[PDB]
Write an enzyme that holds these catalytic residues in place. Sequence first.
Site, PDB file in Angstrom:
ATOM      1  N   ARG A  55       0.861  -1.180   0.000  1.00  0.00           N
ATOM      2  CA  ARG A  55       0.000   0.000   0.000  1.00  0.00           C
ATOM      3  C   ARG A  55       0.892   1.224   0.000  1.00  0.00           C
ATOM      4  O   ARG A  55       1.816   1.310   0.795  1.00  0.00           O
ATOM      5  CB  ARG A  55      -0.913   0.017   1.231  1.00  0.00           C
ATOM      6  CG  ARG A  55      -1.895   1.202   1.287  1.00  0.00           C
ATOM      7  CD  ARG A  55      -2.892   1.107   2.455  1.00  0.00           C
ATOM      8  NE  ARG A  55      -3.929   0.112   2.202  1.00  0.00           N
ATOM      9  CZ  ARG A  55      -4.088  -1.033   2.881  1.00  0.00           C
ATOM     10  NH1 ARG A  55      -3.286  -1.359   3.889  1.00  0.00           N
ATOM     11  NH2 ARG A  55      -5.062  -1.872   2.541  1.00  0.00           N
ATOM     12  N   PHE A  60       1.183  10.696   2.067  1.00  0.00           N
ATOM     13  CA  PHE A  60       0.713  10.089   3.315  1.00  0.00           C
ATOM     14  C   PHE A  60       1.713   9.072   3.809  1.00  0.00           C
ATOM     15  O   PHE A  60       2.432   9.347   4.770  1.00  0.00           O
ATOM     16  CB  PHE A  60      -0.694   9.494   3.135  1.00  0.00           C
ATOM     17  CG  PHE A  60      -1.271   8.866   4.378  1.00  0.00           C
ATOM     18  CD1 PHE A  60      -2.386   8.035   4.284  1.00  0.00           C
ATOM     19  CD2 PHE A  60      -0.716   9.091   5.636  1.00  0.00           C
ATOM     20  CE1 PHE A  60      -2.944   7.449   5.408  1.00  0.00           C
ATOM     21  CE2 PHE A  60      -1.272   8.495   6.773  1.00  0.00           C
ATOM     22  CZ  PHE A  60      -2.396   7.679   6.652  1.00  0.00           C
ATOM     23  N   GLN A  63       3.228   1.461   3.132  1.00  0.00           N
ATOM     24  CA  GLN A  63       2.967   0.401   4.119  1.00  0.00           C
ATOM     25  C   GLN A  63       3.501  -0.945   3.665  1.00  0.00           C
ATOM     26  O   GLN A  63       3.353  -1.323   2.505  1.00  0.00           O
ATOM     27  CB  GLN A  63       1.468   0.272   4.363  1.00  0.00           C
ATOM     28  CG  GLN A  63       1.102  -0.603   5.558  1.00  0.00           C
ATOM     29  CD  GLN A  63      -0.397  -0.613   5.781  1.00  0.00           C
ATOM     30  OE1 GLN A  63      -1.107   0.255   5.279  1.00  0.00           O
ATOM     31  NE2 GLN A  63      -0.885  -1.601   6.521  1.00  0.00           N
ATOM     32  N   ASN A 102      -1.901  -1.147  12.502  1.00  0.00           N
ATOM     33  CA  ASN A 102      -2.632  -1.986  13.427  1.00  0.00           C
ATOM     34  C   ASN A 102      -4.096  -2.077  13.017  1.00  0.00           C
ATOM     35  O   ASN A 102      -4.524  -1.417  12.062  1.00  0.00           O
ATOM     36  CB  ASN A 102      -2.456  -1.499  14.873  1.00  0.00           C
ATOM     37  CG  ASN A 102      -3.084  -0.158  15.121  1.00  0.00           C
ATOM     38  OD1 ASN A 102      -4.258   0.046  14.826  1.00  0.00           O
ATOM     39  ND2 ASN A 102      -2.311   0.771  15.693  1.00  0.00           N
ATOM     40  N   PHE A 113       4.387   1.302   8.684  1.00  0.00           N
ATOM     41  CA  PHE A 113       4.385   2.266   7.623  1.00  0.00           C
ATOM     42  C   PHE A 113       5.490   3.279   7.801  1.00  0.00           C
ATOM     43  O   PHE A 113       6.037   3.434   8.891  1.00  0.00           O
ATOM     44  CB  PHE A 113       2.999   2.898   7.406  1.00  0.00           C
ATOM     45  CG  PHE A 113       2.440   3.634   8.599  1.00  0.00           C
ATOM     46  CD1 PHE A 113       1.754   2.954   9.592  1.00  0.00           C
ATOM     47  CD2 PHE A 113       2.547   5.018   8.689  1.00  0.00           C
ATOM     48  CE1 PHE A 113       1.204   3.625  10.662  1.00  0.00           C
ATOM     49  CE2 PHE A 113       2.011   5.706   9.771  1.00  0.00           C
ATOM     50  CZ  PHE A 113       1.335   5.004  10.765  1.00  0.00           C
ATOM     51  N   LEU A 122      -2.811  10.395  13.713  1.00  0.00           N
ATOM     52  CA  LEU A 122      -2.548   9.013  14.081  1.00  0.00           C
ATOM     53  C   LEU A 122      -1.940   8.967  15.475  1.00  0.00           C
ATOM     54  O   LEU A 122      -1.773   7.890  16.059  1.00  0.00           O
ATOM     55  CB  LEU A 122      -1.625   8.343  13.052  1.00  0.00           C
ATOM     56  CG  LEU A 122      -2.178   8.213  11.615  1.00  0.00           C
ATOM     57  CD1 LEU A 122      -1.157   7.531  10.677  1.00  0.00           C
ATOM     58  CD2 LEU A 122      -3.494   7.455  11.593  1.00  0.00           C
ATOM     59  N   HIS A 126      -1.266   5.004  16.711  1.00  0.00           N
ATOM     60  CA  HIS A 126      -0.238   4.154  16.125  1.00  0.00           C
ATOM     61  C   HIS A 126       1.088   4.432  16.812  1.00  0.00           C
ATOM     62  O   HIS A 126       1.419   5.581  17.056  1.00  0.00           O
ATOM     63  CB  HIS A 126      -0.136   4.396  14.614  1.00  0.00           C
ATOM     64  CG  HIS A 126      -1.314   3.879  13.856  1.00  0.00           C
ATOM     65  ND1 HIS A 126      -2.434   4.646  13.613  1.00  0.00           N
ATOM     66  CD2 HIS A 126      -1.559   2.666  13.301  1.00  0.00           C
ATOM     67  CE1 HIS A 126      -3.316   3.932  12.933  1.00  0.00           C
ATOM     68  NE2 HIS A 126      -2.808   2.727  12.730  1.00  0.00           N
TER      69      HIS A 126
END
Length: 164
Positions: A55, A60, A63, A102, A113, A122, A126
Amino acid sequence: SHMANVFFNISINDKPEGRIVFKLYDEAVPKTAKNFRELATGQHGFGYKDSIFHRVIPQFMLQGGDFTRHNGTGGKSIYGEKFADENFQVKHTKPGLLSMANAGANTNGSQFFITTVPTSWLDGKHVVFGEVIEGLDIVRKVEGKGSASGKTNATIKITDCGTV
């Protein structure tokens, strides 16, 4: 190599791009750093070597870390299927941070990531556990090959990894 930096050799679409090197925050989240580090060394007989980034969302994050199913559905930790959120001491304040993916509170596995921007939304959700200190150009090049949807046609592969 107990607190040694971690490298990934990265290929994109089958061509070698060089290496990414991470400094892990052993001084804040040692259990979380240990997990990533030992999956990169493969010392337990499994880990990140030959896995891919599944991903990639421009502006952003990238991942990866799913070394069991290789598509974002898997991953496991050195501690078992999952482990707790260690703490949220470090916030997502700058590009190029390592942070655990997660599925809700206390569900850390092996997926992680690399942010390409600050992602303060986040924070407290995270666990941030390190930063890229070499290979930001590779991060940016990979980032440029993703899409808003997160899907990518690039094969971005960790061809080797461990400590340096």
